[PDB]
Design a protein around this ligand. Structure first.
Ligand SMILES: [Zn+2]
Length: 42
């Protein structure tokens, strides 16, 4: 139920460390290693 979305090519920011990125894929690939979480189980 989205409505009134103002997105695009605006600056990016990681929700784990707070690093800035210029490329979209960069933020995604970063989230992979950027976990900061130990061995978790089901
Ligand atoms: Zn990060």
């Amino acid at each position: 139920g989205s409505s009134g979305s103002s997105g695009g090519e605006t600056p990016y920011l990681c929700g784990q460390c707070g690093k800035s990125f210029t490329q979209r894929g960069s933020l995604a690939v970063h989230q992979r290693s950027c976990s900061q979480s130990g061995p978790s189980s089901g």
